[PDB]
């Protein structure tokens, strides 16, 4: 059977938001030495009222209470050769996002618990006893908040492994839709909701609220109290030790959301969406391992139709395989200034 | 905290519809000698076509693949004194419904769906024996909807299973909630296509054959071979039951009304309909006349015993928790049937 099976963490102090046990889903591939560890996304909450609102409407993302005992791997987590041509035979790990902290929270005592960073550490620990100790490659992957979770945790995982005495494991990151800009909103608004709040201000508040840690290498590049900078890809990325492949829609829906763009087209708005994509292209200029198509979308790597997207006649699975080889083209950014200008874009 | 923990059946050849392992949730109460085994409901499917659409639309009821590792006991399964004042401390078991066969499938053999409801119950009971059940005084087999009818189909089989296994000191009892149906004429006829609106006699006739379903022997020996469908209907199977069985049944069950093709959208209500609903209450009350242990409010609703608000409904000043406690004593009124046959004549009906 191909289903990933749920394991809830044995260590008791590491929990979801509501105190219920955190966990991970696993499908072993007992001949393979490739490990794919996926971090789920789905926003965050940065004060009590917002978190209480998320609890009433999106409880899945704050609790393990109703997690199914198995899960079907999809996209990059699929065991179907046709859905996942290069990596279908890998050991597959799915880590549910139940900490609402962009996987940054690192204090083990608690109201709502915020333990994103410790959940990862603890998943890694358990996996060692389940084959991870024999790995050639551990690819920490993630979508949206999980994608930003990758940039926040990839070096911490590399260093956890080497401190645990497994330095041969090669640790890499794949960040999908977690590469945002701390930019000016289109039309300004106050920080009320999760949805509307300015990228900068959301993280500023969040980090204080979660006791969030940022990677040590990025942290020391900024003054104490300015740790928020490290939640933004173009700032944390240059500091990274592990190789990280960046997948980002040039017009990410979540980027637009926090930028306050709601969707008839205003002419002032056309010039902003144009500019945003150009700035993103700019930030990705020196990012050798990247796949940035000019579409209006959000997330891709565990979507089934992740195979159908192409940039410069190359698919995403191919780009990733070229990247794995490099350690066929690898730097795939669209020079194409408008949404839907790629014919590959999802429907 | 007080959550029931999942155990999948060790014998993996006893399965849900799709081949996945069946199982049960358990909360151990080691100081208690009472056991409550709950059978979940949620319809059935009686041919390949609607079993396929049920698989597309309601996969949870044909598979164990999406079950959580733990479950909170509610109502009669709750460990909260206030939610469940007499039984909070019992040993608690929830048996999810993944067989779509009203718990009647006894056939291991079966590319087809597998129907193993009666075998699932059998396996749950035998596993439980090694987890404390062997030292029990009371095993109450409870169920809601299809699980309610499943209680009627299975309670004596469980009693026979335990005596044969050398545990005669376990008193087996039944609690059937919303599993007491009439094999009646529909209000407006439909062709038997959709599960939920296929006339009840016809649905069961097809089901039994499709599931290779079994009915209790004592009821079976009372009808012609091939007419075993009769034994899915409470008033027909109840008289030959050996085990004592408490019957909880809304006078106007939404599932009964649905298989009768009655739809209470609102607006005015026609005279033909009014007449039909009146007769339904009457026939239902009549079938309960010689059931000493019953609780039948005049409400339009579905299921109750694992609902959090199961403590609120009253019949003649008596609550369901109390009614059950009284029944426990008997083995303090126990025969509680509303006499006004209109939905909501009773003021304590659920909203
Ligand atoms: C399941 O396995 C047990 C022990 O191996 C056996 O005794 C039991 O009868 C089996 N049940 C069925 C229905 O095959
Ligand atoms: Cl295991
Ligand atoms: Cl999809
Ligand atoms: Cl190649
Ligand atoms: Cl155990």
How many Cβ pairs within 8 Å bridge chains A and B?
23
Distances (CA, A) of B331 to B37, B45, B186, B245, B246: 19, 37, 38, 11, 12
Euclidean distance between CA atoms A95 and A311, whole angstroms: 29
Residue B52, token pair as written in the block: 């396929």
* B256, B262, B267, B272: CA torsion to nearest 10: -110
Q: Are A289 and A329 within 8 A, CB to CB? A: no
Residue A250, token pair as written in the block: 């040039």
Euclidean distance between CA atoms A96 and A64, whole angstroms: 9
Q: At what angle do helices A145-163 and A116-128 cross, to 10 degrees?
A: 50
Non-local (6+) Cβ contacts of B267 within 8 A are none
Q: Which A residues 24-83 touch B at CB under 8 Å?
A: 64-70
Domain boundaries, chain A: 1-347
Euclidean distance between CA atoms B307 and A221, whole angstroms: 57
Q: Mark A128-161 as b/e (b = at least 16 C-beta within 10 Å).
A: beebbeebebbbbbbbbbbbbbbbbbbbbbbebb
Euclidean distance between CA atoms A196 and A181, whole angstroms: 15
Q: Mark A302-336 as b/e (b = at least 16 C-beta within 10 Å).
A: bbeebbebbbeebbbbbbbbbbbeeeeebbbbbeb
Nearest to A143, CA basis, from A334, A303, A347: A303
The answer, for A18 touching chain B at a CB cutoff of 8 Å, is no
Output DSSP code: residue A230: G
Euclidean distance between CA atoms A62 and A48, whole angstroms: 13
Q: Which of B123, B127, B129 to mutate to test the pocket of ligand 1 (most atoms within 8 A of CB)?
A: B123
Q: Sign (positive/negative) of CA torsion B257, B260, B266, B269? A: negative
Q: What are phi and psi of B322, to 5 degrees?
A: -60, -50
Euclidean distance between CA atoms A145 and A203, whole angstroms: 12
A68 and B66: CB-CB below 8 Å?
Answer: yes
B68 and A68: CB-CB below 8 Å?
Answer: yes
Helices (H), A17-168: 48-57, 116-128, 145-163
Q: Which residues surround ligand 3, an ion (CB under 5 A)?
A: A 303-304
Q: What are phi and psi of A288, to 5 degrees?
A: -60, -40
Residue A244, token pair as written in the block: 């990280």
Nearest to B95, CA basis, from B37, B44, B145: B37
- With H, G, I as helix, E, B as strand and everything else as coil, classify residue B94: strand
B108 lines ligand 1 (CB under 6 A): yes
Nearest to A3 among B6, B65, B68 (CB): B65
Ligand nearest, relative to CA of residue A328: 4
Place of tokens 């009906």: B349
Breaks (C-N over 2.5 A) in chain A follow: 110, 263, 327
Residue B262, token pair as written in the block: 């009655």
Q: Are A2 and A72 within 8 A, CB to CB? A: yes
Atom of ligand 1 nearest to the CA of B13: 14
- Burial degree of B350 (CB within 10 A; 0-12, 13-18, 19+): middle
Euclidean distance between CA atoms A230 and A282, whole angstroms: 18
Ligand nearest, relative to CA of residue B116: 1
B121 lines ligand 1 (CB under 6 A): no
Q: Is A252 a catalytic residue?
A: yes
Euclidean distance between CA atoms A259 and A255, whole angstroms: 6
Q: At what angle do helices B146-164 and B117-129 cross, to 10 degrees?
A: 50
Nearest to A65 among B65, B66, B68 (CB): B68
Residues in chain B: 351
Q: Are B184 and B283 within 8 A, CB to CB? A: yes
Nearest to B48, CA basis, from B189, B206, B205, B201: B206
Output DSSP code: residue A111: -
Q: Are B78 and B24 within 8 A, CB to CB? A: no
């Amino acid at each position: 059977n191909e289903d990933l099976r749920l394991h809830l963490l044995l260590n008791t102090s590491v929990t979801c938001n509501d105190g219920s046990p955190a966990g991970y889903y696993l499908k072993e591939s007992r001949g393979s030495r490739r490990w794919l560890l996926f971090l789920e996304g789905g926003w965050y909450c940065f004060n009590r009222e917002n978190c209480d609102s998320r609890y009433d409407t999106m409880r899945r993302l704050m609790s393990s209470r109703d997690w199914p005992r198995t899960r079907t791997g999809t996209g990059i987590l699929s065991s179907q050769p046709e859905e996942n041509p290069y990596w279908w035979n890998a050991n597959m790990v799915f880590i549910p996002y139940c900490s609402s902290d962009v996987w940054s929270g690192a204090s083990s005592k608690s109201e709502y618990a915020f333990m994103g960073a410790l959940i990862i550490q603890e998943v890694v620990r358990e996996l060692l006893g389940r084959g991870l100790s024999g790995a050639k490659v551990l690819l920490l992957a993630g979508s949206s908040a999980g994608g930003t979770g990758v940039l926040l945790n990839v070096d911490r995982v590399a260093e956890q492994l080497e401190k645990l005495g497994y330095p041969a494991i090669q640790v890499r990151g794949l960040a999908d839709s977690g590469w945002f800009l701390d930019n000016k909103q289109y039309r300004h608004t106050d920080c009320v909701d999760t949805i509307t709040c300015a990228p900068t201000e959301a993280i500023r508040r969040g980090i204080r609220y979660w006791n969030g840690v940022v990677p040590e290498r990025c942290r020391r590049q900024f003054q104490e109290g300015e740790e928020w900078n490290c939640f933004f890809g173009y700032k944390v990325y240059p500091t990274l030790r592990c190789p990280v492949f960046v997948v980002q829609w040039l017009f990410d829906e979540a980027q637009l959301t926090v930028d306050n763009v709601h969707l008839p087209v205003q002419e002032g708005l056309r010039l902003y969406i144009q500019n945003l994509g150009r700035e993103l292209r700019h930030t990705l200029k020196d990012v050798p391992a990247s796949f940035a198509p000019a579409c209006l979308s959000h997330e891709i790597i565990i979507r089934s139709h992740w195979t159908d997207v192409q940039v410069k006649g190359t698919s995403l699975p191919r780009a990733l395989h070229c990247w794995d080889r490099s350690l066929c083209p690898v730097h795939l950014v669209d020079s194409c200034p408008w949404p839907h200008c790629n014919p590959s874009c999802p429907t």
